[PDB]
């Protein structure tokens, strides 16, 4: 089955969270499709590419990940990058 994770900003620190709440969780669906779970609610957001186009299908009920992903306070106008977070849940694939 798919490999959730459970990441956190103690592990991960302020400077690169990206999200705004300190835990979320990961996944790699196959086709190596990552998503964002929120803890609390079970909703999910598209993290790379191949993701979206799984939610754009139809195929995934999800939100779009803006809807958690917060602002980045040293880049004004853009949002936290998820380049971390993406290199964190690439590495559940199989």
Not at 17 to 23: K, P
Not at 54 to 69: R, W
């Amino acid at each position: 089955a798919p490999q959730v994770i459970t990441v956190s900003r103690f592990e991960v620190g302020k400077d690169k969270w990206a999200f705004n709440r300190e835990e979320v969780m990961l996944t790699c669906r196959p086709g190596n499709a990552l998503y964002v779970i929120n803890p609390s609610t079970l909703v999910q957001y598209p993290l790379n590419d191949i993701a979206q186009k799984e939610v754009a299908s139809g195929k995934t009920n999800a939100q779009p990940i803006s809807v958690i992903q917060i602002d980045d306070p040293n880049n004004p106008g853009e949002k936290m990058s998820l380049a971390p977070f993406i290199e964190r849940a690439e590495k559940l694939c199989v």
